[PDB]
Amino acid sequence: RCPKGSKAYGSHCYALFLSPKSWTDADLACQKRPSGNLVSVLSGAEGSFVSSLVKSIGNSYSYVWIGLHDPTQGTEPNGEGWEWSSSDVMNYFAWERNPSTISSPGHCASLSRSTAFLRWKDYNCNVRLPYVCKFTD
Known part of the structure; x- marks a missing residue:
């Protein structure tokens, strides 16, 4: 049971929102879902x-x-x-560069089409971006 364009994985229904939302706005919105919250990523x-x-x-x-x-x-x-706000603890890694390389970047990570969305880049937790949201029943 998953909405159209939505895909299940692990134990939550994932859905893409072409609607931009601050990392704190999508976090609070995808949170209003059954334990939902910005997509997670603990596996390659x-x-x-x-x-x-x-x-x-x-x-x-x-x-x-x-x-x-x-x-x-x-x-x-x-x-x-x-730490993932929707997965648990850092059990997986795939960031482009460590925050210790730049003068303390933002406090939120996003996918970068430059790396085929296979790498995470830091960004102002306020800039809004198209995001994904996981949520079981």
């Missing part, structure tokens, strides 16, 4: 599955928001937390 197969789910979004969109943020919130004197 899910990171590639979500990419194919948003790889046909449209040239009018190259990046996509996901449920990944920086638990350091500007504290970890190094930058090595990265």
Whole structure:
């Protein structure tokens, strides 16, 4: 049971929203769903599955928001937390560069069409982007 254009995986129905939403706005919205919340990514197969789910979004969109943020919130004197707001703990990795390379980037990660949506890039948790949302029953 999953909406059209929606695809199930692990244990939640995923749906793409061509509607932009701050990482904090899609997080709170996809949260209003049955334990839903910005798409998750704890497996090398899910990171590639979500990419194919948003790889046909449209040239009018190259990046996509996901449920990944920086638990350091500007504290970890190094930058090595990265936690999914809809998956659990960092059990999977696929970021382009570590936040310790740039002067503390934003506190939210998004997909970058440049890497075929197979890499996460930091972005201002406020910039809104087309996003995905997972949610079981």
